[PDB]
Amino acid sequence: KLLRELRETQESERKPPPYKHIKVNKPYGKVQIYTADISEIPKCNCKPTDENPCGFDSECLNRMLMFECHPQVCPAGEFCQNQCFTKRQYPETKIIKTLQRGWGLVAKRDIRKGEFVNEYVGELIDEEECMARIKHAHENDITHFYMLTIDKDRIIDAGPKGNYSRFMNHSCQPNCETLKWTVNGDTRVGLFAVCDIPAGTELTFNYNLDCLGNEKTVCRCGASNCSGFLG
Ligand SMILES: C[S@@+](CC[C@H](N)C(=O)[O-])C[C@H]1O[C@@H](n2cnc3c(N)ncnc32)[C@H](O)[C@@H]1O
Ligand SMILES: [Zn+2]
Ligand SMILES: [Zn+2]
Ligand SMILES: [Zn+2]
């Protein structure tokens, strides 16, 4: 069978196929977008003279509630360490080729538990649009999906456009998790470490929680607790 011969040839591409490398979510069609003026953004009670103001180990009111400080609002001023999403403060990573799971992402330094790894960025779409894309993909034998739910009727599609977090694969035993933060009046999806991650270890997360279209995809994460699918 010609189709099995096609898979068998399984050659060596030196680069992932094209996508637009974007900094920030980009809305499409009739999706809802939210913004806040400087005045609406919450203000913590950190001082600029604090050990690590608005830092990971700090008692920051904004940090605790998963709100990002604004530069003009924060009482710590420029010494605010709670600006990860806006400043795009990602550990350096590298795209690698895996054997069974296509392209993947590893980091270039050690990452500590709870640390900001990346923002899941992409084309912002509503649910009707997402369902149409999935239906079209399934009809056209497309097996790669990059859909992640923000809330009902807001889905990030990192397929056409995204950043490096689009290369993060699914594991049944992940070292990263998604957490929904409030940044400048809207919801943003961060990737954070669930454990200490040594440099050169593949960065992964559990797609069951928030990703769409993967119900038919067989899992090859290799973990001892592998359930066998991505969704
Ligand atoms: C968000 S992309 C991850 C990066 C992708 N491997 C690439 O090369 O662009 C998700 C897709 O990667 C593949 N994938 C990711 N994790 C996988 C896993 N654990 N087992 C099998 N395929 C996986 C599937 O094609 C899935 O639709
Ligand atoms: Zn603070
Ligand atoms: Zn702050
Ligand atoms: Zn698995």
PDB file of C-alpha atoms and ligand atoms in Angstrom:
ATOM      1  CA  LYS A   1       0.000   0.000   0.000  1.00  0.00           C
ATOM      2  CA  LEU A   2       1.418   3.319  -1.400  1.00  0.00           C
ATOM      3  CA  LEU A   3       0.311   5.232   1.751  1.00  0.00           C
ATOM      4  CA  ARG A   4       2.428   2.954   3.997  1.00  0.00           C
ATOM      5  CA  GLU A   5       5.351   3.336   1.528  1.00  0.00           C
ATOM      6  CA  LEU A   6       4.947   7.154   1.937  1.00  0.00           C
ATOM      7  CA  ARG A   7       5.363   6.903   5.770  1.00  0.00           C
ATOM      8  CA  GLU A   8       8.246   4.349   5.399  1.00  0.00           C
ATOM      9  CA  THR A   9      10.429   6.827   3.340  1.00  0.00           C
ATOM     10  CA  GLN A  10      10.366   9.069   6.571  1.00  0.00           C
ATOM     11  CA  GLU A  11      13.425  11.205   5.411  1.00  0.00           C
ATOM     12  CA  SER A  12      15.352  14.138   7.001  1.00  0.00           C
ATOM     13  CA  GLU A  13      14.060  17.750   6.857  1.00  0.00           C
ATOM     14  CA  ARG A  14      16.597  20.172   8.408  1.00  0.00           C
ATOM     15  CA  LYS A  15      13.950  22.815   9.383  1.00  0.00           C
ATOM     16  CA  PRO A  16      10.303  22.781  10.672  1.00  0.00           C
ATOM     17  CA  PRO A  17       7.788  23.746   7.945  1.00  0.00           C
ATOM     18  CA  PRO A  18       6.943  27.509   7.795  1.00  0.00           C
ATOM     19  CA  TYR A  19       5.053  29.435  10.500  1.00  0.00           C
ATOM     20  CA  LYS A  20       5.066  33.157  11.357  1.00  0.00           C
ATOM     21  CA  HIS A  21       7.155  33.849  14.512  1.00  0.00           C
ATOM     22  CA  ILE A  22       5.020  36.273  16.533  1.00  0.00           C
ATOM     23  CA  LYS A  23       5.539  38.085  19.849  1.00  0.00           C
ATOM     24  CA  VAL A  24       1.867  38.557  20.931  1.00  0.00           C
ATOM     25  CA  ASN A  25      -1.590  36.937  20.284  1.00  0.00           C
ATOM     26  CA  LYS A  26      -3.190  38.153  17.046  1.00  0.00           C
ATOM     27  CA  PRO A  27      -6.997  38.126  16.812  1.00  0.00           C
ATOM     28  CA  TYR A  28      -8.886  36.649  13.838  1.00  0.00           C
ATOM     29  CA  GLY A  29     -12.478  37.193  12.714  1.00  0.00           C
ATOM     30  CA  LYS A  30     -15.184  37.729  15.289  1.00  0.00           C
ATOM     31  CA  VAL A  31     -13.161  36.766  18.422  1.00  0.00           C
ATOM     32  CA  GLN A  32     -13.417  38.963  21.519  1.00  0.00           C
ATOM     33  CA  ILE A  33     -10.418  41.011  22.688  1.00  0.00           C
ATOM     34  CA  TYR A  34     -10.078  42.822  26.042  1.00  0.00           C
ATOM     35  CA  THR A  35      -7.752  45.681  27.029  1.00  0.00           C
ATOM     36  CA  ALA A  36      -7.121  47.751  30.173  1.00  0.00           C
ATOM     37  CA  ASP A  37      -5.938  51.297  30.547  1.00  0.00           C
ATOM     38  CA  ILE A  38      -3.017  51.743  33.034  1.00  0.00           C
ATOM     39  CA  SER A  39      -5.695  52.942  35.598  1.00  0.00           C
ATOM     40  CA  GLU A  40      -7.551  49.526  35.610  1.00  0.00           C
ATOM     41  CA  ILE A  41      -4.422  47.347  36.335  1.00  0.00           C
ATOM     42  CA  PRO A  42      -4.091  46.055  39.994  1.00  0.00           C
ATOM     43  CA  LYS A  43      -1.364  47.553  42.224  1.00  0.00           C
ATOM     44  CA  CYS A  44       0.572  45.401  44.740  1.00  0.00           C
ATOM     45  CA  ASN A  45       2.077  46.628  48.114  1.00  0.00           C
ATOM     46  CA  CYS A  46       5.784  45.750  47.239  1.00  0.00           C
ATOM     47  CA  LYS A  47       8.415  48.466  47.803  1.00  0.00           C
ATOM     48  CA  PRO A  48      11.319  49.119  45.278  1.00  0.00           C
ATOM     49  CA  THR A  49      13.711  48.603  48.294  1.00  0.00           C
ATOM     50  CA  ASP A  50      12.487  44.927  48.737  1.00  0.00           C
ATOM     51  CA  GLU A  51      14.884  41.917  48.445  1.00  0.00           C
ATOM     52  CA  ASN A  52      13.272  40.734  45.192  1.00  0.00           C
ATOM     53  CA  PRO A  53      10.307  43.108  44.553  1.00  0.00           C
ATOM     54  CA  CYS A  54       7.351  41.314  42.884  1.00  0.00           C
ATOM     55  CA  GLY A  55       9.811  38.375  42.531  1.00  0.00           C
ATOM     56  CA  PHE A  56       9.071  34.641  42.506  1.00  0.00           C
ATOM     57  CA  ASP A  57       9.891  34.210  46.238  1.00  0.00           C
ATOM     58  CA  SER A  58       8.153  37.538  47.164  1.00  0.00           C
ATOM     59  CA  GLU A  59       4.841  38.190  48.992  1.00  0.00           C
ATOM     60  CA  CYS A  60       3.530  40.131  45.869  1.00  0.00           C
ATOM     61  CA  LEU A  61      -0.297  40.550  45.932  1.00  0.00           C
ATOM     62  CA  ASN A  62      -0.316  40.656  42.088  1.00  0.00           C
ATOM     63  CA  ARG A  63       1.940  37.610  41.757  1.00  0.00           C
ATOM     64  CA  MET A  64      -0.094  35.477  44.217  1.00  0.00           C
ATOM     65  CA  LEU A  65      -3.327  36.174  42.273  1.00  0.00           C
ATOM     66  CA  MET A  66      -1.604  35.573  38.858  1.00  0.00           C
ATOM     67  CA  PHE A  67      -1.818  39.251  37.792  1.00  0.00           C
ATOM     68  CA  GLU A  68       1.126  40.779  35.952  1.00  0.00           C
ATOM     69  CA  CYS A  69       2.321  44.247  37.320  1.00  0.00           C
ATOM     70  CA  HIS A  70       2.242  47.154  34.855  1.00  0.00           C
ATOM     71  CA  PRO A  71       5.503  49.293  34.597  1.00  0.00           C
ATOM     72  CA  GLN A  72       3.626  52.652  35.223  1.00  0.00           C
ATOM     73  CA  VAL A  73       1.427  51.193  38.028  1.00  0.00           C
ATOM     74  CA  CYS A  74       3.872  49.125  40.145  1.00  0.00           C
ATOM     75  CA  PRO A  75       5.194  50.776  43.357  1.00  0.00           C
ATOM     76  CA  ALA A  76       8.503  48.815  42.826  1.00  0.00           C
ATOM     77  CA  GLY A  77       8.904  50.843  39.583  1.00  0.00           C
ATOM     78  CA  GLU A  78      11.537  49.321  37.296  1.00  0.00           C
ATOM     79  CA  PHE A  79      12.767  46.885  39.994  1.00  0.00           C
ATOM     80  CA  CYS A  80       9.450  44.970  39.565  1.00  0.00           C
ATOM     81  CA  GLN A  81      10.222  41.282  38.879  1.00  0.00           C
ATOM     82  CA  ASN A  82       6.571  40.536  37.887  1.00  0.00           C
ATOM     83  CA  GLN A  83       6.676  41.518  34.157  1.00  0.00           C
ATOM     84  CA  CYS A  84       7.536  38.142  32.562  1.00  0.00           C
ATOM     85  CA  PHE A  85       4.815  38.047  29.877  1.00  0.00           C
ATOM     86  CA  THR A  86       5.252  41.728  28.673  1.00  0.00           C
ATOM     87  CA  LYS A  87       9.109  41.541  28.666  1.00  0.00           C
ATOM     88  CA  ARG A  88       8.953  38.018  27.088  1.00  0.00           C
ATOM     89  CA  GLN A  89      11.418  36.762  29.748  1.00  0.00           C
ATOM     90  CA  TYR A  90      11.855  33.212  28.452  1.00  0.00           C
ATOM     91  CA  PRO A  91      14.697  30.810  29.286  1.00  0.00           C
ATOM     92  CA  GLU A  92      16.754  30.368  26.085  1.00  0.00           C
ATOM     93  CA  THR A  93      15.514  27.273  24.206  1.00  0.00           C
ATOM     94  CA  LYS A  94      16.453  25.256  21.093  1.00  0.00           C
ATOM     95  CA  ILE A  95      14.219  23.411  18.579  1.00  0.00           C
ATOM     96  CA  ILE A  96      15.311  19.746  18.287  1.00  0.00           C
ATOM     97  CA  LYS A  97      14.180  16.868  16.098  1.00  0.00           C
ATOM     98  CA  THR A  98      12.709  13.966  18.095  1.00  0.00           C
ATOM     99  CA  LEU A  99      12.341  10.410  16.616  1.00  0.00           C
ATOM    100  CA  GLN A 100       8.515   9.906  16.981  1.00  0.00           C
ATOM    101  CA  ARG A 101       6.994  13.254  17.973  1.00  0.00           C
ATOM    102  CA  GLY A 102       8.278  15.560  15.189  1.00  0.00           C
ATOM    103  CA  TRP A 103      10.047  18.772  16.284  1.00  0.00           C
ATOM    104  CA  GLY A 104      10.389  19.502  20.038  1.00  0.00           C
ATOM    105  CA  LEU A 105      11.759  22.252  22.410  1.00  0.00           C
ATOM    106  CA  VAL A 106      14.652  21.915  24.979  1.00  0.00           C
ATOM    107  CA  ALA A 107      16.144  24.702  27.167  1.00  0.00           C
ATOM    108  CA  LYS A 108      19.775  26.018  27.237  1.00  0.00           C
ATOM    109  CA  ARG A 109      19.789  26.625  31.014  1.00  0.00           C
ATOM    110  CA  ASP A 110      18.447  24.835  34.129  1.00  0.00           C
ATOM    111  CA  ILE A 111      14.893  25.910  34.992  1.00  0.00           C
ATOM    112  CA  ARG A 112      13.629  25.856  38.661  1.00  0.00           C
ATOM    113  CA  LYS A 113      10.156  24.568  39.761  1.00  0.00           C
ATOM    114  CA  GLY A 114       7.412  27.197  39.288  1.00  0.00           C
ATOM    115  CA  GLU A 115       9.545  29.304  36.858  1.00  0.00           C
ATOM    116  CA  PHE A 116       8.056  31.041  33.751  1.00  0.00           C
ATOM    117  CA  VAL A 117       9.140  29.085  30.671  1.00  0.00           C
ATOM    118  CA  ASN A 118       7.149  30.692  27.793  1.00  0.00           C
ATOM    119  CA  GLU A 119       3.833  32.201  26.682  1.00  0.00           C
ATOM    120  CA  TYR A 120       1.549  30.154  24.461  1.00  0.00           C
ATOM    121  CA  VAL A 121       0.968  32.689  21.663  1.00  0.00           C
ATOM    122  CA  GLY A 122      -0.906  32.316  18.314  1.00  0.00           C
ATOM    123  CA  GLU A 123      -3.874  33.336  16.202  1.00  0.00           C
ATOM    124  CA  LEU A 124      -6.870  34.127  18.484  1.00  0.00           C
ATOM    125  CA  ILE A 125     -10.032  32.447  17.206  1.00  0.00           C
ATOM    126  CA  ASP A 126     -13.580  31.795  18.420  1.00  0.00           C
ATOM    127  CA  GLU A 127     -15.071  28.272  18.808  1.00  0.00           C
ATOM    128  CA  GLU A 128     -17.040  28.219  15.493  1.00  0.00           C
ATOM    129  CA  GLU A 129     -13.745  29.096  13.659  1.00  0.00           C
ATOM    130  CA  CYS A 130     -11.727  26.458  15.637  1.00  0.00           C
ATOM    131  CA  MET A 131     -14.281  23.709  14.867  1.00  0.00           C
ATOM    132  CA  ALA A 132     -14.222  24.662  11.139  1.00  0.00           C
ATOM    133  CA  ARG A 133     -10.340  24.465  11.108  1.00  0.00           C
ATOM    134  CA  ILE A 134     -10.344  21.018  12.899  1.00  0.00           C
ATOM    135  CA  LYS A 135     -13.056  19.661  10.481  1.00  0.00           C
ATOM    136  CA  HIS A 136     -11.057  20.899   7.493  1.00  0.00           C
ATOM    137  CA  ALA A 137      -7.803  19.422   8.967  1.00  0.00           C
ATOM    138  CA  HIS A 138      -9.440  15.980   9.637  1.00  0.00           C
ATOM    139  CA  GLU A 139     -10.826  15.893   6.026  1.00  0.00           C
ATOM    140  CA  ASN A 140      -7.374  16.822   4.606  1.00  0.00           C
ATOM    141  CA  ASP A 141      -5.401  14.173   6.617  1.00  0.00           C
ATOM    142  CA  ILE A 142      -3.700  16.930   8.712  1.00  0.00           C
ATOM    143  CA  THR A 143      -2.365  15.323  11.904  1.00  0.00           C
ATOM    144  CA  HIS A 144      -0.634  18.346  13.584  1.00  0.00           C
ATOM    145  CA  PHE A 145      -2.730  20.582  15.841  1.00  0.00           C
ATOM    146  CA  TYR A 146      -1.793  23.721  17.780  1.00  0.00           C
ATOM    147  CA  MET A 147      -5.233  24.689  19.322  1.00  0.00           C
ATOM    148  CA  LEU A 148      -5.297  25.638  23.021  1.00  0.00           C
ATOM    149  CA  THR A 149      -8.457  26.945  24.831  1.00  0.00           C
ATOM    150  CA  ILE A 150      -8.192  30.231  26.798  1.00  0.00           C
ATOM    151  CA  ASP A 151     -11.925  30.147  27.852  1.00  0.00           C
ATOM    152  CA  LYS A 152     -15.216  29.351  26.035  1.00  0.00           C
ATOM    153  CA  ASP A 153     -15.160  30.993  22.566  1.00  0.00           C
ATOM    154  CA  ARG A 154     -11.416  32.031  22.775  1.00  0.00           C
ATOM    155  CA  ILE A 155      -8.893  29.490  21.359  1.00  0.00           C
ATOM    156  CA  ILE A 156      -5.159  30.124  20.612  1.00  0.00           C
ATOM    157  CA  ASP A 157      -4.214  28.583  17.256  1.00  0.00           C
ATOM    158  CA  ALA A 158      -0.375  28.513  17.186  1.00  0.00           C
ATOM    159  CA  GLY A 159      -0.462  26.637  13.807  1.00  0.00           C
ATOM    160  CA  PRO A 160      -0.164  29.550  11.330  1.00  0.00           C
ATOM    161  CA  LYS A 161       1.639  31.845  13.768  1.00  0.00           C
ATOM    162  CA  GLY A 162       3.102  31.451  17.252  1.00  0.00           C
ATOM    163  CA  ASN A 163       6.352  31.386  19.135  1.00  0.00           C
ATOM    164  CA  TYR A 164       8.652  28.512  20.347  1.00  0.00           C
ATOM    165  CA  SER A 165       5.910  27.118  22.750  1.00  0.00           C
ATOM    166  CA  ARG A 166       4.232  25.688  19.554  1.00  0.00           C
ATOM    167  CA  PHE A 167       7.094  23.121  19.485  1.00  0.00           C
ATOM    168  CA  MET A 168       6.418  21.877  23.061  1.00  0.00           C
ATOM    169  CA  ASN A 169       5.186  18.273  22.861  1.00  0.00           C
ATOM    170  CA  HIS A 170       2.626  16.403  24.985  1.00  0.00           C
ATOM    171  CA  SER A 171       3.718  14.256  27.819  1.00  0.00           C
ATOM    172  CA  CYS A 172       1.687  12.113  30.212  1.00  0.00           C
ATOM    173  CA  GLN A 173       4.452  13.025  32.695  1.00  0.00           C
ATOM    174  CA  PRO A 174       5.015  16.687  31.874  1.00  0.00           C
ATOM    175  CA  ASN A 175       7.637  19.021  33.344  1.00  0.00           C
ATOM    176  CA  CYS A 176       5.564  22.180  32.437  1.00  0.00           C
ATOM    177  CA  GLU A 177       1.950  23.292  32.880  1.00  0.00           C
ATOM    178  CA  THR A 178      -0.254  26.022  31.501  1.00  0.00           C
ATOM    179  CA  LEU A 179      -1.466  28.762  33.898  1.00  0.00           C
ATOM    180  CA  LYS A 180      -3.898  31.547  32.896  1.00  0.00           C
ATOM    181  CA  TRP A 181      -2.625  35.008  34.001  1.00  0.00           C
ATOM    182  CA  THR A 182      -4.207  38.487  33.755  1.00  0.00           C
ATOM    183  CA  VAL A 183      -1.870  40.799  31.775  1.00  0.00           C
ATOM    184  CA  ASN A 184      -2.921  44.343  30.657  1.00  0.00           C
ATOM    185  CA  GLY A 185      -6.642  43.661  30.930  1.00  0.00           C
ATOM    186  CA  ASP A 186      -6.731  40.250  29.248  1.00  0.00           C
ATOM    187  CA  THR A 187      -6.138  36.466  29.832  1.00  0.00           C
ATOM    188  CA  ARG A 188      -2.693  35.139  28.752  1.00  0.00           C
ATOM    189  CA  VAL A 189      -1.493  31.486  28.781  1.00  0.00           C
ATOM    190  CA  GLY A 190       1.864  30.940  30.487  1.00  0.00           C
ATOM    191  CA  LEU A 191       3.964  27.807  30.536  1.00  0.00           C
ATOM    192  CA  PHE A 192       5.541  27.209  33.964  1.00  0.00           C
ATOM    193  CA  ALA A 193       7.815  24.456  35.282  1.00  0.00           C
ATOM    194  CA  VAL A 194       6.166  21.825  37.597  1.00  0.00           C
ATOM    195  CA  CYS A 195       9.628  20.515  38.674  1.00  0.00           C
ATOM    196  CA  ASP A 196      13.329  21.410  38.337  1.00  0.00           C
ATOM    197  CA  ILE A 197      14.349  20.985  34.648  1.00  0.00           C
ATOM    198  CA  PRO A 198      18.031  20.282  33.818  1.00  0.00           C
ATOM    199  CA  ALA A 199      19.347  22.064  30.661  1.00  0.00           C
ATOM    200  CA  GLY A 200      18.883  19.910  27.508  1.00  0.00           C
ATOM    201  CA  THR A 201      15.702  18.157  28.763  1.00  0.00           C
ATOM    202  CA  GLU A 202      12.687  18.300  26.388  1.00  0.00           C
ATOM    203  CA  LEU A 203      10.025  20.829  27.639  1.00  0.00           C
ATOM    204  CA  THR A 204       6.566  19.241  27.730  1.00  0.00           C
ATOM    205  CA  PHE A 205       3.016  19.751  28.973  1.00  0.00           C
ATOM    206  CA  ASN A 206      -0.240  17.712  29.306  1.00  0.00           C
ATOM    207  CA  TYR A 207      -2.418  18.554  26.223  1.00  0.00           C
ATOM    208  CA  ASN A 208      -5.503  16.780  27.741  1.00  0.00           C
ATOM    209  CA  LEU A 209      -6.139  19.757  29.965  1.00  0.00           C
ATOM    210  CA  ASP A 210      -6.770  22.497  27.225  1.00  0.00           C
ATOM    211  CA  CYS A 211      -5.814  21.335  23.701  1.00  0.00           C
ATOM    212  CA  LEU A 212      -8.268  20.326  20.884  1.00  0.00           C
ATOM    213  CA  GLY A 213      -8.262  17.997  17.849  1.00  0.00           C
ATOM    214  CA  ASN A 214      -5.925  15.296  19.284  1.00  0.00           C
ATOM    215  CA  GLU A 215      -8.589  12.593  20.217  1.00  0.00           C
ATOM    216  CA  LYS A 216      -7.301  10.277  17.412  1.00  0.00           C
ATOM    217  CA  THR A 217      -3.525  10.931  17.872  1.00  0.00           C
ATOM    218  CA  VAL A 218      -1.662   7.971  19.466  1.00  0.00           C
ATOM    219  CA  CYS A 219       0.748   9.069  22.274  1.00  0.00           C
ATOM    220  CA  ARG A 220       4.469   8.317  21.944  1.00  0.00           C
ATOM    221  CA  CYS A 221       5.646  10.301  25.078  1.00  0.00           C
ATOM    222  CA  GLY A 222       7.321   7.119  26.357  1.00  0.00           C
ATOM    223  CA  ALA A 223       6.388   7.838  30.087  1.00  0.00           C
ATOM    224  CA  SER A 224       5.655   4.827  32.338  1.00  0.00           C
ATOM    225  CA  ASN A 225       2.135   6.241  33.043  1.00  0.00           C
ATOM    226  CA  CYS A 226       1.308   6.762  29.305  1.00  0.00           C
ATOM    227  CA  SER A 227      -2.483   6.545  28.745  1.00  0.00           C
ATOM    228  CA  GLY A 228      -1.945   6.205  24.935  1.00  0.00           C
ATOM    229  CA  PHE A 229      -3.536   9.358  23.446  1.00  0.00           C
ATOM    230  CA  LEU A 230      -3.052  13.160  23.567  1.00  0.00           C
ATOM    231  CA  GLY A 231      -6.754  13.885  23.956  1.00  0.00           C
TER     232      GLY A 231
HETATM  233  C1  LIG B   1       1.756  21.706  19.316  1.00  0.00           C
HETATM  234  S1  LIG B   1       2.467  20.516  18.183  1.00  0.00           S
HETATM  235  C2  LIG B   1       4.063  20.118  18.948  1.00  0.00           C
HETATM  236  C3  LIG B   1       5.243  20.320  17.994  1.00  0.00           C
HETATM  237  C4  LIG B   1       5.224  19.415  16.757  1.00  0.00           C
HETATM  238  N1  LIG B   1       5.801  18.080  17.087  1.00  0.00           N
HETATM  239  C5  LIG B   1       6.003  19.988  15.564  1.00  0.00           C
HETATM  240  O1  LIG B   1       6.928  19.274  15.112  1.00  0.00           O
HETATM  241  O2  LIG B   1       5.666  21.115  15.123  1.00  0.00           O
HETATM  242  C6  LIG B   1       1.464  19.059  18.546  1.00  0.00           C
HETATM  243  C7  LIG B   1       1.609  17.969  17.498  1.00  0.00           C
HETATM  244  O3  LIG B   1       2.863  17.290  17.670  1.00  0.00           O
HETATM  245  C8  LIG B   1       2.656  15.861  17.669  1.00  0.00           C
HETATM  246  N2  LIG B   1       2.847  15.354  19.041  1.00  0.00           N
HETATM  247  C9  LIG B   1       3.102  16.126  20.154  1.00  0.00           C
HETATM  248  N3  LIG B   1       3.278  15.407  21.240  1.00  0.00           N
HETATM  249  C10 LIG B   1       3.125  14.094  20.823  1.00  0.00           C
HETATM  250  C11 LIG B   1       3.160  12.859  21.501  1.00  0.00           C
HETATM  251  N4  LIG B   1       3.433  12.771  22.798  1.00  0.00           N
HETATM  252  N5  LIG B   1       2.974  11.705  20.801  1.00  0.00           N
HETATM  253  C12 LIG B   1       2.732  11.805  19.473  1.00  0.00           C
HETATM  254  N6  LIG B   1       2.663  12.919  18.738  1.00  0.00           N
HETATM  255  C13 LIG B   1       2.863  14.044  19.469  1.00  0.00           C
HETATM  256  C14 LIG B   1       1.261  15.645  17.058  1.00  0.00           C
HETATM  257  O4  LIG B   1       1.296  15.715  15.641  1.00  0.00           O
HETATM  258  C15 LIG B   1       0.527  16.872  17.591  1.00  0.00           C
HETATM  259  O5  LIG B   1      -0.601  17.205  16.814  1.00  0.00           O
HETATM  260 ZN    ZN B   2       4.498  43.214  43.977  1.00  0.00          ZN
HETATM  261 ZN    ZN B   3       5.396  44.710  40.598  1.00  0.00          ZN
HETATM  262 ZN    ZN B   4       1.931   9.493  26.696  1.00  0.00          ZN
END
